[PDB]
Amino acid sequence: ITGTSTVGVGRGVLGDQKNINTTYSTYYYLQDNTRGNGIFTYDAKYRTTLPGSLWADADNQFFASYDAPAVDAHYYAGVTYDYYKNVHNRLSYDGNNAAIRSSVHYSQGYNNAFWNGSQMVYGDGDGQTFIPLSGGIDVVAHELTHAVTDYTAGLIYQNESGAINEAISDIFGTLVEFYANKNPDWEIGEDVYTPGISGDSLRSMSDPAKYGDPDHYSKRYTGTQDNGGVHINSGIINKAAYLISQGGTHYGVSVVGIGRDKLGKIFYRALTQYLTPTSNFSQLRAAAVQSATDLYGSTSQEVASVKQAFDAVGVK
Ligand SMILES: N[C@@H](CCCC[NH3+])C(=O)O
Ligand SMILES: O[C@@H]1[C@@H](O)[C@H](O)OC[C@H]1O
Ligand SMILES: O[C@@H]1[C@@H](O)[C@H](O)OC[C@H]1O
Ligand SMILES: O[C@@H]1[C@@H](O)[C@H](O)OC[C@H]1O
Ligand SMILES: [Ca+2]
Ligand SMILES: [Ca+2]
Ligand SMILES: [Ca+2]
Ligand SMILES: [Ca+2]
Ligand SMILES: [Zn+2]
């Protein structure tokens, strides 16, 4: 909507107070005009018709419980945007400052969020397995990273190419969580997952096995469930990334860490220069290996670490 760019205030899912860029025209709409062509947040009103209604607020103050999911979705979408702009020199998910649209209050007790090819969609959770999922910055960045992939590598969402796609969203969802630096870890969804269980998460990049996911190519799931286990075998590529950045010894193979920032530059370049829709794990290794060579040279520690990490997880 047309209006004047102003700044509101509100509290998020986790009870933290934060400012949000809004637009005034009778009401105060969740419309962030300070970022690309806009970050718009909508209200699905507990239904599944998308996007819904561009969030309208009468006083620019968003402290009601019903406003919280919209606050985090509106706020954390801008954080992810900033991450891709400041770090990777990418303007929104399509590189041309595409508008970022998110719908909250999706359906009733919906325990999931997703990118539907055009927007992000957050459920409020059933209060037991999940609380509103926009509360997790890694969740928000995870889903917006799916948009970045759709516009770049375009990895099919099935089998190895899908696991890579999921792994990319887990990686850059974690790196955004660090980029914001508010209780950052190598776990996925800890901030919105099971409020009545202290210390657990949905997935674990550090130890995928913690929750039953493979951390080595031998233990990969080969059935049909989960589009071939895209949320399962992502652990193999999650672990590899966790080793590239943090380093360690995994099944006896030792990996020297190079840090998060370099992991990011490597995987982004792979995602935007060398990966294709049908890429597989072995092709992902090659993509990361070339990226690290372009960035730091063939005889560099970075290249060695990549080879060491994909070796540790059994990817040749
Ligand atoms: N995001 C993952 C896990 C969500 C938790 C189960 N609903 C998936 O959709 O597979
Ligand atoms: O209580 C909710 C209120 O916060 C919102 O503004 O409109 C819908 C209501 O259900
Ligand atoms: O507020 C209620 C909401 O919690 C539920 O999801 O759907 C019914 C609503 O009235
Ligand atoms: O997935 C497994 C989990 O269920 C168990 O509790 O601890 C070991 C894991 O491999
Ligand atoms: Ca208000
Ligand atoms: Ca965290
Ligand atoms: Ca996390
Ligand atoms: Ca928990
Ligand atoms: Zn995903």
No. of helices (H) and no. of strands (E), the chain: 8, 15
- Neighbouring C-beta atoms of residue 55, cutoff 10 Å: 26
Nearest Cα neighbor of 37 from 85, 71, 69 is: 85
Resolution (A): 3.0
Q: What does the DSSP 8-state code read for residue 119? A: -
Catalytic residue among 105, 143, 160, 216: 143
- Our mutation pick for probing the ligand 2 site, out of 30, 46, 66, counting the most ligand atoms within 8 A of Cβ, is 66
| 231: annotated active-site residue | yes
Residue given tokens 């997880």 in the structure block: 313
Domain ranges in the chain are 6-154, 155-315
Long-range contacts of 195-199 (CB under 8 A, 24+ apart): 195/127, 195/131, 196/128
Give the ligand 2 atom nearest the CA of 67: 4
Feature table: binding site = 57, 59, 61, 138, 142, 146, 166, 177, 183, 185, 187, 190, 193-194, 197, 200
Q: What does the DSSP 8-state code read for residue 45? A: T
Give the ligand 1 atom nearest the CA of 226: 10
Pair 215, 158: CB distance under 8 Å: no
Is the domain 6-154 a CATH 3.10.170.10 member?
yes
63 touches ligand 2 (CB under 6 Å): no
Beta strands in the chain (DSSP E): 4-11, 17-25, 27-29, 31-32, 39-43, 53-54, 56-57, 61-62, 100-106, 113-115, 120-123, 187-188, 203-204, 248-250, 253-255
Nearest Cα neighbor of 3 from 60, 48, 51, 49 is: 60
Cβ-Cβ contacts under 8 Å for 86 (sequence gap 6 or more): none
Nearest ligand atom owner, CA of 63:
5
Q: Which one-letter amino acid corresponds to residue 182?
A: K
Cα 282 to middle of ligand 4, angstroms: 27
| 143: annotated active-site residue | yes
Give the technique used to solve this structure: X-ray
**Residue-by-residue DSSP string for 181-212:** TSS--SEESTTTB-TTSTT--SEESS-GGGGT
Backbone angles phi, psi at 101, to 5 degrees: -120, 130
List residues, by chain if needed, whose CB lies under 5 Å from ion ligand 9: 169
The ligand 1 site (C-beta within 6 Å) comprises 111-112, 202, 231
| CATH architecture label of 155-315 | Orthogonal Bundle (1.10)
Nearest Cα neighbor of 99 from 163, 160, 144 is: 144
Q: Is 168 left (phi over 0), alpha (psi -120 to 50) or beta?
A: alpha
Pair 193, 201: CB distance under 8 Å: yes
Alpha-carbon distance of 239 to 187, in angstroms, equals: 11
**Residue-by-residue DSSP string for 228-263:** HHTTTTHHHHHHHHHHHHH-EEETTEEE----HHHH
Nearest Cα neighbor of 260 from 201, 191, 177 is: 177
67: three-class secondary structure by DSSP: helix
Feature table: binding site for Ca(2+) = 57, 59, 61, 138, 177, 183, 185, 187, 190, 193-194, 197, 200
Cα 204 to middle of ligand 7, angstroms: 9
